[PDB]
Amino acid sequence: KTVVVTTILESPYVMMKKNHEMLEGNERYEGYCVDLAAEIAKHCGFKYKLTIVGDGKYGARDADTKIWNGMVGELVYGKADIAIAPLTITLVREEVIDFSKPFMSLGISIMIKKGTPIESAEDLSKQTEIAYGTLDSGSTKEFFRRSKIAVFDKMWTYMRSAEPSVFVRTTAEGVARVRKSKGKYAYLLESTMNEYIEQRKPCDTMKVGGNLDSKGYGIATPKGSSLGNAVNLAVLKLDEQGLLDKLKNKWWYDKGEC
Ligand SMILES: C=C(C)[C@H]1CN[C@H](C(=O)O)[C@H]1CC(=O)O
* Binding site membership of 171 for ligand 1 (Cβ less than 6 Å): yes
Provide the β-strand partners of residue 3.
48
**Fold identical between 1-106+216-255 and 107-215?**
yes
Residues with Cβ within 8 Å of residue 89, at least 6 apart in sequence? 99, 102, 215, 216, 217, 218
Q: How was this structure determined?
A: X-ray
CA distance 206 to 198: 5
Ligand 1 in contact with 189 (CB < 6 A)?
Answer: yes
Separation CA 79–CA 218 (nearest Å):
19
Residue 248 and residue 192: Cα distance in Å, rounded? 10
* Reported resolution, Å: 2.1
Whether the CA torsion 186, 187, 190, 191 is positive or negative: it is negative
Sign of CA dihedral 131, 88, 251, 24: negative
Atom from ligand 1 closest to the CA of residue 87: 9
What is the distance in angstroms between the CA of the first residue and the CA of the last residue of the chain? Answer: 43
CATH classification for the domain delimited by 1-106+216-255, as one of 3.40.710.10, 3.40.50.300, 3.40.190.10, 3.40.50.1000: 3.40.190.10
3-state SS record for the chain: CEEEEEECCECCCEEECCCHHHCCHHHHEECHHHHHHHHHHHHHCCEEEEEECCCCCCCCECCCCCCECHHHHHHHCCCCCEECCCCECCHHHHCCEEECCCCEEECEEEEEECCCCCCCHHHHHHCCCCEEECECCCHHHHHHHHCCCHHHHHHHHHHHCCCCCCCECCHHHHHHHHHHCCCCEEEEEEHHHHHHHHCCCCCCEEEECCCCCCEEECCEEECCCCCHHHHHHHHHHHHHCCHHHHHHHHHHHHCCCC
Strands 2-7 and 82-83: parallel
Confirm if 153 and 147 have CB atoms less than 8 A apart: yes
Please tell me if the CB atom of residue 58 comes closer than 6 angstroms to any atom of ligand 1. Answer: yes
Cβ of 76 closer than 6 Å to ligand 1, yes or no, is no
- Residues 6 or more apart whose CB falls under 8 angstroms from that of 40 comprise 84, 219, 231, 234, 235, 238
Tell me the fold of 107-215. D-Maltodextrin-Binding Protein; domain 2 (3.40.190)
User: What residue spans define the domains of the chain?
Assistant: 1-106+216-255, 107-215
Binding-site positions for L-glutamate read 86, 88, 93, 139-140, 190
Q: How far is the CA of 211 from the centre of ligand 1 (A)?
A: 15
- Give yes or no for residue 88 CB within 6 A of ligand 1: yes
